[PDB]
Protein backbone atom coordinates (compact mmCIF):
# COMPACT_ATOMS: atom_id res chain seq x y z
CA UNK A 1 0.00 0.00 0.00
CA UNK A 2 2.85 2.37 0.91
CA UNK A 3 5.85 0.48 -0.54
CA UNK A 4 7.42 -0.12 -3.98
CA UNK A 5 9.59 -3.13 -4.83
CA UNK A 6 12.90 -2.08 -6.42
CA UNK A 7 15.57 -4.51 -7.68
CA UNK A 8 19.17 -3.74 -8.69
CA UNK A 9 20.45 -6.00 -11.49
CA UNK A 10 24.14 -5.04 -11.30
CA UNK A 11 26.85 -3.31 -9.24
CA UNK A 12 26.65 -0.28 -11.57
CA UNK A 13 22.97 0.39 -10.82
CA UNK A 14 21.94 3.14 -8.40
CA UNK A 15 18.84 3.18 -6.17
CA UNK A 16 16.10 5.60 -7.34
CA UNK A 17 15.65 8.38 -4.77
CA UNK A 18 12.96 10.90 -3.81
CA UNK A 19 14.97 13.97 -2.76
CA UNK A 20 12.23 15.86 -0.89
CA UNK A 21 8.79 15.08 0.58
CA UNK A 22 7.43 17.31 -2.21
CA UNK A 23 9.38 15.95 -5.22
CA UNK A 24 6.65 14.00 -7.04
CA UNK A 25 9.10 11.83 -9.01
CA UNK A 26 12.01 9.46 -8.39
CA UNK A 27 15.47 10.23 -9.82
CA UNK A 28 16.66 7.58 -12.29
CA UNK A 29 20.41 7.12 -12.85
CA UNK A 30 22.35 5.66 -15.79
CA UNK A 31 24.27 2.39 -15.38
CA UNK A 32 26.49 2.80 -18.47
CA UNK A 33 28.60 5.37 -20.32
CA UNK A 34 27.07 6.13 -23.73
CA UNK A 35 28.48 8.40 -26.43
CA UNK A 36 25.62 9.57 -28.65
CA UNK A 37 26.50 11.30 -31.92
CA UNK A 38 23.89 13.41 -33.81
CA UNK A 39 20.65 11.59 -34.78
CA UNK A 40 21.68 8.42 -32.89
CA UNK A 41 19.10 6.35 -30.99
CA UNK A 42 19.84 4.19 -27.94
CA UNK A 43 18.17 2.28 -25.11
CA UNK A 44 20.31 3.20 -22.08
CA UNK A 45 20.25 0.45 -19.44
CA UNK A 46 19.61 1.48 -15.83
CA UNK A 47 19.97 -2.07 -14.43
CA UNK A 48 17.00 -1.26 -12.18
CA UNK A 49 13.80 -3.33 -11.96
CA UNK A 50 10.42 -2.29 -10.51
CA UNK A 51 7.27 -4.20 -9.51
CA UNK A 52 4.48 -1.65 -9.95
CA UNK A 53 1.08 -2.92 -8.70
CA UNK A 54 -2.11 -3.24 -10.78
CA UNK A 55 -4.17 -0.09 -11.41
CA UNK A 56 -1.01 2.01 -11.70
CA UNK A 57 1.22 3.11 -14.58
CA UNK A 58 4.86 4.24 -14.41
CA UNK A 59 6.15 7.15 -16.47
CA UNK A 60 9.87 6.96 -17.23
CA UNK A 61 10.30 10.54 -18.45
CA UNK A 62 13.02 13.16 -19.05
CA UNK A 63 14.32 15.70 -16.53
CA UNK A 64 13.43 19.38 -17.05
CA UNK A 65 17.05 20.56 -16.84
CA UNK A 66 18.69 18.01 -19.15
CA UNK A 67 15.98 18.16 -21.86
CA UNK A 68 16.04 21.98 -21.98
CA UNK A 69 19.83 22.34 -22.14
CA UNK A 70 20.81 19.40 -24.37
CA UNK A 71 19.52 17.95 -27.65
CA UNK A 72 18.87 14.67 -25.79
CA UNK A 73 15.23 13.62 -26.25
CA UNK A 74 13.77 10.96 -23.94
CA UNK A 75 10.58 9.30 -25.19
CA UNK A 76 8.41 8.70 -22.11
CA UNK A 77 8.03 4.99 -21.41
CA UNK A 78 4.95 3.45 -19.79
CA UNK A 79 5.86 0.97 -17.06
CA UNK A 80 3.12 -1.64 -16.59
CA UNK A 81 2.58 -4.07 -13.71
CA UNK A 82 3.38 -6.96 -16.08
CA UNK A 83 6.75 -5.82 -17.43
CA UNK A 84 9.49 -6.68 -14.93
CA UNK A 85 13.23 -6.33 -15.52
CA UNK A 86 15.80 -3.82 -16.78
CA UNK A 87 14.26 -0.39 -17.43
CA UNK A 88 15.56 1.23 -20.60
CA UNK A 89 15.80 4.96 -21.29
CA UNK A 90 14.37 5.48 -24.79
CA UNK A 91 16.65 8.27 -26.03
CA UNK A 92 17.72 10.12 -29.20
CA UNK A 93 20.38 12.79 -29.72
CA UNK A 94 18.17 15.12 -31.76
CA UNK A 95 21.08 17.40 -32.75
CA UNK A 96 21.37 17.78 -36.54
CA UNK A 97 24.15 16.01 -38.45
CA UNK A 98 25.93 18.95 -40.10
CA UNK A 99 29.08 16.90 -40.95
CA UNK A 100 31.16 19.29 -38.82
CA UNK A 101 33.78 18.17 -36.29
CA UNK A 102 34.89 19.26 -32.81
CA UNK A 103 37.37 18.04 -30.17
CA UNK A 104 34.89 18.38 -27.30
CA UNK A 105 32.04 16.17 -26.12
CA UNK A 106 29.17 17.67 -24.12
CA UNK A 107 27.74 16.51 -20.79
CA UNK A 108 24.10 16.46 -19.63
CA UNK A 109 24.50 20.17 -18.77
CA UNK A 110 25.56 21.04 -22.36
CA UNK A 111 29.00 22.06 -21.01
CA UNK A 112 32.23 21.23 -22.85
CA UNK A 113 34.13 18.38 -21.18
CA UNK A 114 37.91 18.91 -21.33
CA UNK A 115 39.67 15.55 -21.70
CA UNK A 116 43.45 14.99 -21.48
CA UNK A 117 43.52 12.66 -24.50
CA UNK A 118 42.74 14.62 -27.67
CA UNK A 119 40.09 13.05 -29.92
CA UNK A 120 37.92 14.09 -32.88
CA UNK A 121 34.15 13.97 -32.35
CA UNK A 122 31.23 14.91 -34.61
CA UNK A 123 29.68 18.25 -33.63
CA UNK A 124 26.66 17.95 -31.32
CA UNK A 125 27.75 14.71 -29.63
CA UNK A 126 26.87 13.99 -26.00
CA UNK A 127 28.22 11.71 -23.26
CA UNK A 128 26.31 10.20 -20.33
CA UNK A 129 28.13 8.98 -17.20
CA UNK A 130 27.57 6.31 -14.51
CA UNK A 131 25.04 7.16 -11.79
CA UNK A 132 24.02 10.36 -13.57
CA UNK A 133 20.55 11.92 -13.31
CA UNK A 134 19.09 11.75 -16.82
CA UNK A 135 15.46 10.71 -16.26
CA UNK A 136 12.80 10.37 -13.54
CA UNK A 137 10.00 7.93 -12.64
CA UNK A 138 6.40 9.06 -12.11
CA UNK A 139 3.69 6.62 -10.96
CA UNK A 140 0.07 7.61 -11.68
CA UNK A 141 -3.21 5.72 -11.01
CA UNK A 142 -4.69 4.21 -14.20
CA UNK A 143 -8.38 3.57 -14.95
CA UNK A 144 -9.33 0.27 -16.60
CA UNK A 145 -12.91 -0.20 -17.82
CA UNK A 146 -14.12 -3.17 -19.91
CA UNK A 147 -14.90 -1.51 -23.25
CA UNK A 148 -18.02 -2.36 -25.27
CA UNK A 149 -18.79 -1.45 -28.88
CA UNK A 150 -21.72 0.95 -29.35
CA UNK A 151 -23.25 2.42 -32.52
CA UNK A 152 -23.96 5.77 -30.82
CA UNK A 153 -22.96 7.36 -27.51
CA UNK A 154 -25.37 7.93 -24.60
CA UNK A 155 -24.56 10.05 -21.51
**Binding residues for a second copy, how many (CB under 8 A)?**
67
Give burial (CB, 10 Å; 0-12/13-18/19+) of 70.
buried
Closest distance to Ni ion from the beta carbon of 148 (Å)? 26
The DSSP-derived string for 33-95 is -EEE-TT-EEEEE--EEEEPPTTEEEEEEE-HHHHHHSSEEEPPEEE-SS--S--EEEEEE--
Interface residue with Ni ion among 5, 51, 76, 101 (CB under 5 A) is 76
Binding mask 123-142 for a second copy (x = CB under 8 A): -------------x-xxxxx
Applying the rule CB under 8 A, the residues between 67 and 126 that interact with a second copy are: 67-68, 71, 73, 75-78, 80-82, 84, 88, 90, 92, 94-98
Q: Is 144 in the site for a second copy (CB under 8 A)?
A: yes
Contact 122, 38 (CB under 8 A): yes
> Do the annotations mark residue 101 as ligand-binding?
no
**CB atoms < 10 A from the CB of 150, how many?**
7
d(CA 99, CA 153): 55
- The site for a second copy (CB under 8 A) is made up of 1-8, 15-16, 18, 20-26, 39, 41, 43, 49, 51, 54, 56-57, 61-62, 64, 67-68, 71, 73, 75-78, 80-82, 84, 88, 90, 92, 94-98, 136, 138-154
- The site for Ni ion (CB under 5 A) is made up of 76, 94
Amino acid sequence: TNTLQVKLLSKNARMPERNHKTDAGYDIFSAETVVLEPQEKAVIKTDVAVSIPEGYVGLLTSRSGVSSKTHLVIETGKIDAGIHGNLGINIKNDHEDDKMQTIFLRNIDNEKIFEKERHLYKLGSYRIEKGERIAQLVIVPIWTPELKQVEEFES
